[PDB]
Amino acid sequence: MEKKTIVLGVIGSDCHAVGNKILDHAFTNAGFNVVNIGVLSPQEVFIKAAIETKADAILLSSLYGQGEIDCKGLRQKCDEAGLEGILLYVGGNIVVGKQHWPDVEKRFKDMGYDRVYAPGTPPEVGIADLKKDLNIE
Numbered sequence: 199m200e201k202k203t204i205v206l207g208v209i210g211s212d213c214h215a216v217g218n219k220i221l222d223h224a225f226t227n228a229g230f231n232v233v234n235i236g237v238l239s240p241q242e243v244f245i246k247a248a249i250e251t252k253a254d255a256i257l258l259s260s261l262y263g264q265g266e267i268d269c270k271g272l273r274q275k276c277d278e279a280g281l282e283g284i285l286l287y288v289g290g291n292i293v294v295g296k297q298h299w300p301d302v303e304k305r306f307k308d309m310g311y312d313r314v315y316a317p318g319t320p321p322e323v324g325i326a327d328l329k330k331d332l333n334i335e
Contacts, residue, residue, distance in 0.1 A: 202332065204257075204328055208259050208263065219322070222325075223322065224326065237263070248272075254283030254284060254335065255328040256286060259291075260289070262291065267288050269286070285335055289323060290316060294316045297314055
């Protein structure tokens with residue numbers, strides 16, 4: 199028996215000396231096995247980093263980086279991995295707006311798992327959401 203094993207790649211948030219809505223009730227205020235792995239690097243190196251980050255959740259809170267984010271980048275890895283419990287989520291970003299229309303990301307959303315949560319999403323963004331796609335893994 200164990201808790202979940204979620205991660206968020208690239209750069210998410212850490213309300214320590216930032217102050218956000220991430221540790222509201224859950225994310226890590228729950229007690230999950232959360233890792234916050236750094237920026238985008240080689241997907242073959244993120245594959246090795248997936249051995250460790252064999253996290254059923256990997257919300258790559260990407261601020262525009264890697265092959266169409268870690269969508270074409272790491273989800274292609276996820277595909278040629280096994281896409282077992284590994285749900286690929288996205289987030290972060292800056293100037294969005296066109297993140298509630300793109301039938302392309304939303305293509306890979308219903309086509310995989312690649313959902314996205316950027317500032318505008320609930321106070322427990324891709325948290326209760328990575329849990330959605332974990333409950334729809």
